[PDB]
Design a protein around this ligand. Structure first.
Ligand SMILES: O[C@@H]1[C@@H](O)[C@@H](O)OC[C@H]1O
Ligand SMILES: O[C@@H]1[C@@H](O)[C@@H](O)OC[C@H]1O
Ligand SMILES: [Ca+2]
Ligand SMILES: [Ca+2]
Lengths: 504, 504
């Protein structure tokens, strides 16, 4: 049997996995997007269903001033005696915290802030002796030596017991991070990422008889990397291991699918799966001796995509994210039942601080995305439409707007310091269907007059100019519905009847 | 004593070095730029003076249809019994050739085409037994196994003696390339690049008692790489070794200085220097056990930038390159003595096939570049100015132009599929001084009215949108003087009085 990588496609980085009996749960990083920290369930490690998010309340997720360079960084998920612990960093606040749940269909706890625990990638390990350990990176604010830090933690108090100690510097790669501690076959294993989450990314491992070391580096480190290869999967690492209930071992980690030359990626870092074997002399090796493929052997795992939103429910579907904490009053599913009613503010897609926007990840290279919009702009500044969005300086949009008392469909682009109106056509009704055809190189922007069914190609845009390499930050492309008054409140409401995501 | 890397700054990739007595000569790749293959001289391996170019005639350098993705790839320079051999690939033609010289102040020979020798990075080695070997990469057209290929060569005939043989696959990194064969201390050493000329770049070495192998991989391969580090120098590799006349060993290789995040570079791949030590058991290790720095110890090497062109000579200075083979009649140093007179064609900076353009490499992050132009556009399509140029889809320019019978200074940008006029101001004289202030993040575009000395900032542009990662190809930024008639011949001549390059 076979499966394909990635197992979770689109913007789903830094996977952490947790086994409960014969169920598996997985969390990913979310940066400036709200709600934060998607959570998935699987019974076979291959197929994941999103069950919702871990951070859904302002008290849990403070995203004012967050950008695709900040907000929520790597999350770690652990289970002990009936309680789930989700531990993560809000990099905007420079603070590490834990939330807890005993029922994953319900919401998580208020956060417990871990005072005086800096760095990123916090992780938890429950030892047989009743001790719990927190592990993470060096703290830059304190001028610490580069490497992996650890202490015992009191989970109730959210405080450190005893001393914060450097336990390993890694093999010599940059940014030693993503640390996880495990205990297998009478050894403690410390698993980490090195080389940075880009083309130099790799997984390394060290071992000790003691949770604080001294740790011996694995002699065939790194145990997983696509560095210095031309494989379609790149930037692989930030692994978390699991023993499946049949006794076999597996790792989840992320990787990218870059295109063009030099390689550029726009679907974000995507969650992948690979088997582990343990060598005679007690070391894990991941996949095909430290390498992986898009097609993989499933071992004994039990093997097994169109998404239309009619806005018929008054609860937003789990596909939708907002830029930072949404201004809830600017989105209504109730004003016009069966539609989404959006109120544009002065803020635009060029502004970091919550413009009126709702979006969903691009999860395929080839896809068709569309929406039906009713919008009658009252003034020249007023605008609503469909965006392909990476961050505040990298986005394209097709929209209805007004100029000199005249309604126009426009194609607009922001790339770095360039803001351009690429094309503009007069439009003569209140309703319009916008559609984007995505392929690996190019987005194609069309509109349809709903009353005639006639389609018009308004223009195109390059995928590569929205790539992470170009745009900066740590995320993937979203398709979004937005409204704006371009420096003023938008007096015209925007009504979206539906949204379709049809991947190839 | 110390020196700094890079030793040759700006767009100078794939260095090959050749010792003659106490003199050292070095060549670099030039892609679509004419003249081709710059050649340098040193007496101390640290300080290089450009002595001119190796490919200066149409018969030696056929660049029609060449782009920054094609043209002249890695060159290798060797010396034997009074004759220099320069061997290289014209990738546009998919052909390998050699030119020869016995006097480096004179011109090189007509090319000798090596029929049925494919691949890139051809290299030559003269053995003690009178045999000469050619070494290069796999040939993609023939579906060859990835690795390093070799044969005996007859230099007079430009043909292969005996069989073309795979001699080494490398360590497992992608694109095994840059092969050089040497014989030191009774071993043949095969030195190569792996991992591609980007973030995965590394140098590996293998050895044999025989020139065709079998080759044993060095046990601490790779012997030089900055992969999986955050060092300011990246993408290091494509090395060529030399024994200095004091007996010490040194390697030249290239690397980049990327900025921003993810890392993007715009000064091209730049030539660097590092020492070699030979281990007891007979292996070379480069620099600080396989790593290098911007500041380096000079060993026993004997240690030791404003460039103004007044166009007072009727021979172009060696700083100037053209895009492909120039149309010589469109450039005159004689029509107006002490000025450069340029005739714009229908071709623009957006066209690959020799627009009217002369340019010089950006060799520093911080620099001020300026020119005095006399230009009186006769018609609306007509344009002359100063460009910051990476390739046909990535360039910015400040220029004099005409619109609706009105003269304007404009800032224009081409980034991918975006072409924009960023700013436009009316201008009221025949002469203008254009200046660009470069810093690591930004180019700042100003003009000066020569008669008053008043300066005006017209606009700015991002360095990162001209980076190799963004633009594609294999080159660095040039500052250029250009003229165009935008689809028609330019009826107005452009006169440039001078050009200044003042680096910080
Ligand atoms: O992995 C990341 C690294 O690549 C760097 O650029 O930013 C912080 C690290 O977490
Ligand atoms: O080094 C180069 C590699 O990185 C690839 O992209 O193009 C051909 C090779 O010579
Ligand atoms: Ca509906
Ligand atoms: Ca002059």
């Amino acid at each position: 049997m076979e499966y394909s990588n990635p197992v979770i496609k689109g913007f789903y980085p830094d996977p952490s996995i947790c086994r409960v009996g014969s169920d598996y749960y997985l969390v990913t990083s979310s940066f400036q997007y709200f709600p934060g920290v998607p959570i998935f369930h699987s019974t076979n490690l291959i197929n994941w269903n999103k069950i919702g998010y871990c951070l859904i309340r302002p008290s849990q997720l403070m995203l004012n001033n967050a950008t695709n360079r900040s907000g929520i960084f790597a999350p770690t998920l652990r289970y002990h005696e009936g309680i789930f612990y989700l531990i993560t960093t809000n990099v905007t606040l420079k603070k590490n915290f834990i939330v807890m749940s005993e029922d994953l269909q319900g919401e998580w706890s208020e956060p417990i802030w871990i005072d005086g625990w800096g760095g990123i990638d916090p992780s938890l390990f429950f030892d047989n002796d009743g001790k719990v350990y927190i592990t993470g990176t060096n703290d830059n604010a304190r001028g610490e030596e580069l490497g992996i830090y650890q202490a015992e933690i009191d989970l109730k108090k959210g405080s450190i017991i005893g001393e914060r100690k450097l336990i390993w510097k890694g093999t010599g790669g940059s940014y030693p991070e993503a640390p996880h501690l495990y205990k297998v076959n009478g050894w403690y294993y410390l698993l980490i990422a090195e080389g940075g989450t880009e083309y130099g990314h790799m997984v390394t491992v060290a071992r000790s008889k003691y949770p604080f070391g001294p740790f011996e580096s694995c002699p065939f480190n790194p145990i997983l990397t696509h560095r210095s290869t031309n494989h379609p999967l790149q930037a692989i690492g930030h692994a978390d291991i699991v023993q499946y209930h049949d006794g076999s071992w597996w790792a989840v980690f992320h990787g990218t699918r870059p295109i063009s030359y030099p390689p550029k990626h726009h679907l974000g870092r995507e969650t992948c799966l690979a088997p582990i074997k343990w060598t005679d002399d007690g070391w894990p090796i991941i996949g095909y001796n430290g390498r992986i493929d898009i097609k993989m052997d499933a071992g004994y795992l039990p093997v097994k995509e169109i998404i239309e939103d009619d806005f018929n429910s008054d609860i937003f579907s789990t596909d939708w994210n907002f830029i930072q904490n949404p201004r809830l009053e600017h989105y209504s599913l109730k004003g016009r039942p069966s539609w989404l009613k959006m109120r544009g503010t002065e803020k635009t897609l060029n502004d970091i601080n919550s413009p009126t926007f709702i979006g969903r990840r691009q999860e395929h290279f080839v896809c068709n995305v569309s929406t039906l919009l009713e919008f009658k702009p009252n003034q020249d500044n007023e605008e609503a439409g469909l965006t392909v969005y990476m961050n505040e300086k990298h986005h394209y949009e097709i929209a209805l707007t007004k100029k000199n008392g005249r309604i126009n469909v426009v194609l607009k682009k922001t790339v770095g310091d360039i803001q351009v109106v690429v094309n503009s056509l007069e439009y003569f009704s209140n309703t319009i269907i916008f559609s984007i055809q995505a392929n690996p190189e190019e987005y194609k922007f069309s509109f349809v007059d709903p009353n005639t069914g006639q389609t018009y190609l308004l223009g195109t845009g390059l995928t590569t100019l929205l790539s992470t390499e170009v745009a900066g930050g740590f995320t993937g492309v979203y398709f979004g519905l937005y409204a704006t008054g371009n420096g003023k409140v938008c007096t015209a409401p925007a009504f979206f009847d539906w949204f379709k995501y049809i991947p190839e």
